[PDB]
Design a protein around this ligand. Structure first.
Ligand code: B9Y
Length: 221
């Protein structure tokens, strides 16, 4: 049995919406966002983590291509391997590819492990969002209705399950019979609902929302 509604913002576990700009780094924002919530849960402090650290440093060895795209899973693996990720304040976002400038002096989080969830299992995604925290996912955002979304529960008939844009599921709910996922985007505050989009839930893995979910953990010790 799971709660009907979850919103991790209400628990102080979600940083401000970021603005990725011309750099295709949504995969990096998806990853730091999920890790930011685990960090808050563990330490009580809400700290933006460095998406730029991932763009510059979680590169070819991790199958990623910086501003040309990447994976949250291998972003997490880089953080594990690196034994750290810097704070965003110490290593801020420039929306461009740069040399890796990681400096452990400003490490703001670690990552013990990450977990991947089954493709298309929206019931499994729901349990993880409720019991673990915000979950990194990909969505199919290659539709003008996505770029032009303003408000409400987003449903795009021509959406597919093949994902191309990283986002953060920070909750879910039901608005008078329309079930939705609460999704943090990285297109700044003027996109959608103060930078968030509520996306149709339990509608056959709509827009691939549960195609590739993953979440990191920071274990005691
Ligand atoms: O959607 C479908 C089919 O339904 N995909 C085909 C299979 C697939 C897809 C994704 C996936 C998940 C999240 C995101 C996003 F959130 F960022 F948006 C994306 S965006 C595409 C990211 N890409 C762009 C070109 C390159 F720069 C490499 C990164 C894709 N993961 N996987 C599974 C594996 O292939 C992952 N791989 C396993 C071996 C080790 C490395 C990771 C896309």
């Amino acid at each position: 049995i799971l709660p009907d509604s979850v919103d991790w913002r209400e628990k102080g576990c979600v940083t401000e919406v970021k603005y990725q700009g011309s750099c295709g780094a949504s995969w990096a924002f998806s990853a730091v966002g999920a890790l930011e919530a685990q960090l808050k849960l563990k330490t009580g402090k809400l700290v933006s983590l460095s998406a730029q650290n991932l763009v510059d440093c979680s590169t070819e060895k991790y199958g990623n291509k910086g501003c040309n795209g990447g994976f949250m899973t291998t972003a997490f693996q880089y953080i594990i391997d690196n034994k750290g990720i810097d704070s965003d304040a110490s290593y801020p976002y420039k929306a461009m590819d740069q040399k890796c400038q990681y400096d452990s002096k400003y490490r703001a989080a670690t990552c013990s492990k990450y977990t991947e969830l089954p493709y298309g299992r929206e019931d499994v995604l729901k349990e993880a969002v409720a019991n673990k925290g915000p979950v990194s996912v990909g969505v199919d955002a290659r539709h003008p209705s996505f770029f032009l979304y303003r408000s409400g529960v987003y449903y795009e008939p021509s959406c597919t399950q093949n994902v191309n844009h990283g986002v953060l599921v920070v909750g879910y709910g039901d608005l008078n019979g329309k079930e939705y996922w609460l999704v943090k985007n990285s297109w700044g505050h003027n996109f959608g609902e103060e930078g968030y989009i509520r996306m149709a839930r339990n509608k056959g893995n709509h827009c691939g929302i549960a195609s590739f979910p993953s979440y990191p953990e920071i274990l005691q010790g």
